[PDB]
């Protein structure tokens, strides 16, 4: 989806990253801090 994705890091810092509508949004992504932040409700867990 074409939304601004927001990954919250271990520090609680929220990270904004604009994706296109062709891209799927996961709840983990390496951020500019060097930590995989968790986007608030994203992909489907197994």
Distance from C-alpha of 1 to C-alpha of 30, rounded to nearest angstrom? 19
Query: What class, spelled out in words, does domain 1-46 have in CATH?
Result: mainly beta
For the CA atoms of the chain, what is the radius of gyration? 10
Residues 11, 33: contact at Cβ < 8 Å? yes
How does 7-45 read in b/e, with b if 16+ C-beta sit within 10 Å?
bebeeeeebeeeeeeeeebebebebeeebebbbeebeee
- Method for structure elucidation: NMR
- Name the residue ranges covered by the structural domains of the chain: 1-46
Q: How far apart, in whole angstroms, are the C-alpha atoms of residue 43 and residue 7?
A: 12
């Amino acid at each position: 989806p074409r939304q601004i994705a927001r990954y919250r890091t271990d520090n609680g810092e929220e990270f904004e990253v604009p994706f296109a509508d062709d891209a799927e949004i996961p709840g983990t992504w390496l951020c500019r801090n060097g930590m995989e932040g968790t986007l608030i409700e994203g992909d489907l867990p197994e």
